[PDB]
Nucleic acid binder design. Sequence first.
DNA 1: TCGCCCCCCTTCGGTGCTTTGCACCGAAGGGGGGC
Lengths: 553, 406
Amino acid sequence: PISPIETVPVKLKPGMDGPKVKQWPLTEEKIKALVEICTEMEKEGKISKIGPENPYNTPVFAIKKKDSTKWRKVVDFRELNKRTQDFWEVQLGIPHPAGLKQKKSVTVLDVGDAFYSVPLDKDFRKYTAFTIPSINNETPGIRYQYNVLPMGWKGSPAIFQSSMTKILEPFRKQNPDIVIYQYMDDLYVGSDLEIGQHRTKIEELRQHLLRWGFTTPDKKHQKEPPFLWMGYELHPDKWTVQPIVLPEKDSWTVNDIQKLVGKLNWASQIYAGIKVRQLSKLLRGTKALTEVVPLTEEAELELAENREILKEPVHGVYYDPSKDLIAEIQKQGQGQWTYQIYQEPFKNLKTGKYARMKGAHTNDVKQLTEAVQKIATESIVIWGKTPKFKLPIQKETWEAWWTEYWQATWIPEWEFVNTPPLVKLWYQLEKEPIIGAETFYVDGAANRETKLGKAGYVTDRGRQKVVPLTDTTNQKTELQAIHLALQDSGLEVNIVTDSQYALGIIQAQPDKSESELVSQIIEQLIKKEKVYLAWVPAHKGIGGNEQVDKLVS
Amino acid sequence: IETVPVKLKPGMDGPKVKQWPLTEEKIKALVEICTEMEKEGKISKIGPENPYNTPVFAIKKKDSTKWRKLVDFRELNKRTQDFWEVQLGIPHPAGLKQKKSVTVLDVGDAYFSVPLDKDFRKYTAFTIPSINNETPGIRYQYNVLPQGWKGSPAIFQSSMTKILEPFRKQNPDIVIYQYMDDLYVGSDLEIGQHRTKIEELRQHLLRWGGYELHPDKWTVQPIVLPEKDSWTVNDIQKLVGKLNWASQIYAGIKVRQLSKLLRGTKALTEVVPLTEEAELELAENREILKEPVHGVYYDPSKDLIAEIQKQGQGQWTYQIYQEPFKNLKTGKYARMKGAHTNDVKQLTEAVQKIATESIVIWGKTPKFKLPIQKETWEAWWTEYWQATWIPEWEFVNTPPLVKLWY
DNA sequence: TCGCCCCCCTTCGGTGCTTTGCACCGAAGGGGGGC
Ligand SMILES: C=C1[C@H](COP(=O)(O)OP(=O)(O)OP(=O)(O)O)[C@@H](O)C[C@@H]1n1cnc2c(=O)nc(N)[nH]c21
Ligand SMILES: [Mg+2]
C-alpha cells in the first residue's frame, strides 16, 4: 500500500536540471526480477509509464536481499543525487543494546516495502525517470518514473524516517510506558505489561501502521527471545553480537587487513582488550588495495591474541537506571587503551577501546584524558549521563600534572585502581635551577636555503661542542642542541635555550613522539635525575647564550 | 504586525551545524520547552527538507533552578546581514561602567511577540536529539524573533525603547543597555536599594511581557617585576627576557645595562650583585610598568580579542586588545568554589566574567583565545555556562616563555 | 555500478605563525556495522 501521508516537498539545487544518462546491460535473471517488481510496482501504483516528452533518465540495477531469494531494485541516482537539494539528516546515531533496560515483553517488527509505501512529491517525480533494459538488444526499454521513494535517491532515507516518525507519534503519546526503538523501518517494542496486554498493544500498533499504509509482514515479526536486532541477539537477561568471522589468509592484501581491522573494531564493543595497532601499522605507506603485505611478527602476535579473545563467549547486560554507571580503563601499551562499562562487577554493559594518536608529541596522562573524554561522550549518547571512573593513575600523579601544565584540564569523579601498568609522568622539570649542576647554554642554527646547520653548547664549567648537521631545519637544530646537552651532561643539569619551539615541546612533558629526534630527547630526559630548562631571547648578547650563538656561527 | 525583510550576507548560506550529545535532563527540558513553544506557535515542527541546523542545549542558573533553552546561533549571527547598514543597531552608553552596581535581566521572552520574516525562518532550524538514538532527531524552526539571534534586538529595538521610556524618565541616573537577550541595568544606589529598583523594572516589563556586578573594583593587573635582595644569574635572565617582551608594549625600556651584568658563561645559581647602572635601569622600568600605556584607544569598528593564561591556585590572568600589544585592559580573574578541583569550570567562569566586562565596557564580547584543548573544552563547558549569549572562541596551546602577567 | 547514519585508521591539504617547517584540524579514502 501507499501511505496517504503528505508528501515532503523537494527541490533540485539552484541552476541545476535533471539527470540524462543511458541504461547499461544487465542479466536475464535480474531483468525478469525487475519486470516482476516493475509491472507489479506499476500495478501497485509505485511507478508510472512515461514517454519521450520527459527528457530525463537514470540507469537501474538489482542486488540480492538477506530475506531468502528476494531481490532489491535499486537505481543509480548518482547524477540526480548531486543535483538534488541538501537535507538535514535526522538519524543522529545508532542505538546500542547496552542502553536498553530490561523489559517484561519484547517484540521486533519490520515494515514491508518501507520506502515504496511513502509517496514522492509530485513535482519531483519526473526527475526519477528510468528505463528497464530486458536483454538490452531485443527492443528499446520501457520508461517509468517513481511515485514513491526510490532506493538509491539521496533524500529517501530522511523522508522515510521523518514520515515514520510522524506516523508513530499518535501512538507514542498514547502509550508512554511502551518503548519503541525506531531504526529505519525496524521497530523494537518493549513494555512491562503482561504478554496478553502486550500482544494487544502490538496488534493495535500494527493496525495504526496499516491504516497509514505500512504493512508488518509475519516473517519479520519476532515475538520470542532471542530477538535479532541491529546485529545483536537480545536475550531476557543478556545480549550478544551476532557471530564475528575473521578472515583467515595465508597471503594478505591491504584490503584484507583493512577488513580485519574493521571486524576487530566492531568486536571491541563487547570483547575486552582487542588491539589493532600492529595490524593497522601494516596499512601505512601502502599504495594499492591489492598490494600484498607480509604480516610483521608483532602483527601476527596481536592477531593471535585477538583470536584468543574472540574464542571465548561474551555477553553484555542491560542498563539499570537505579544504579551507577562505572567506567574502568587499562593501559595496553603504545598509546592503546581499553575500557569496560558496568554497574555490577564482572557484568559489562559494553567494552571499547581508544587508540588514536593525537598530535606529534604527547604523553600517557593526556591520552588517558582523551580516553576519558571519548567514554564520557559515548556514555551521554547511550545512557544520558556520564559514569564514575576507575583509573590506573595515582591522585598525586594527576595533581602533579594539572598544576605543572599550562592548559586547563580536568577529569570527573574518579577512583584510583591499581591495575599495572599505571599511568605516570616519566620525568618532571625542576621549577628552580639546580645548585651544583652544570649550566649548558645551547643553540642550533640552520641555513634555510642550504638545509645545513650546526648544534652546540657552552658551559659554565668551560665545556664546548659544535656538531655539523646535514639536511636539517631551524627547529631540528634547536632540538639537536638540547639533545647534545642532555647527552654530555651528568644526572643533574641546567639548560638555557633561546628556542620557544623546543621549550614548548619539552615543557609539556611528552613521553612519546612521532619524531625520532624528540623520542631520543625523551629517553634522555627520563634517565636524568633533575633537569632545569630555561629560555632567553636570542640575539640580545646575554651571557652564555651570546657565546654559544657566536660559536654556532 | 508585519515582518521586517531580512537577508543573509551576500554569497553566504545558512548554518549547517550538527547537534552534539545531550544529557537526559537537558533533553527532557528541551522537549518540554519546545512542545509548549510549539503549542503557542512560537516554533513549528519541520522535516529534513530544510537543510539548515544549529545546535541547541540548555542551562540552569542555580538561583533560578528552572531550565533555559539556549540555541547556539553564533554561526547564524555571523551570516546575518548587519543592522548598522539598515540603521537598526543599538548604541552603547559610556556611563554603564561608571555605576557601582549593574544587574543583568534576561528579557529574551519579549522577542516572542514579534513574527519573523517567513523567508528567513528556515535558517533557524534546530534538532532535539534522543537518548541512545531511540528515535530520529526532532526538528523545529522559529516563527518569531528567536532568542540569541542578533537580529532580534535590532528588530525589537523601537518597541523596547517604548516599554523602557517611562522607567528611565522616572530614573534619569539609571543606565540601561540592551545586549542580545539581556538588559544591563546599573546605578549608584545602596546594594539593597539598587535591588529594590531592579524589582520595579521587572514588574513594568511583566505588565506587557542575575547577581550584582560591581565595575568599580575590576582592578587592572599590571606587569610586575620581582623584588629581591640578592639576584641570581637565573633571576636576571628571567628578568631581562620579561622586559624584552614588554618592550613590545611599553616605550623606551632598557636592558643593555642588565644584559651585560651577565657577561660570560655563568652558573645559573651564581649570585650577581646589582650595579648602580643596573639598579638605575631596573627601578626606572618598574615606574614605566606602574602606570598604563599612552596612545591606546578603543576602536568600535574592530573586534575585541581576549587572551587568558592559567596561573595556578585558582588564578587566571587576561588581556583584552584589538591590535597586538595594545591592551585595552589587563586583569586577573580569581574564583574559589572551596574545592579548587576544576580548571574547566574555572576557565568557563572566567570567560563569562571577562565577556560580561566587555559588554559593560564596550558593548560587545571579545573573541577568546582559550588555553585549553578543543576536545577537553567541548566535553564539559556547557555544564558551567550561565549566560544567554555565547562568545566566539578558538583554542591555543601557548607554552609560557616568560610569566609576563605574574 | 545505489542511498542515509554511526564507529576507527590513514592520508591529504588548507591555515596561520611576529614561520621558511610545523602543528593543528577537517575532509576524504579505506574498512566495520545498521536499515
Ligand atoms: C532502510 C531501507 C528500507 C529497509 O529495508 P528492508 O531490508 O527492511 O526491506 P524493505 O522494507 O524494503 O522490504 P522488506 O522489509 O519486505 O524486505 C528499504 O525500504 C530501503 C532502505 N534500504 C535498505 N537496504 C538498502 C540498500 O541497500 N540500498 C538502499 N538504497 N536502500 C536500502
Ligand atoms: Mg522493511
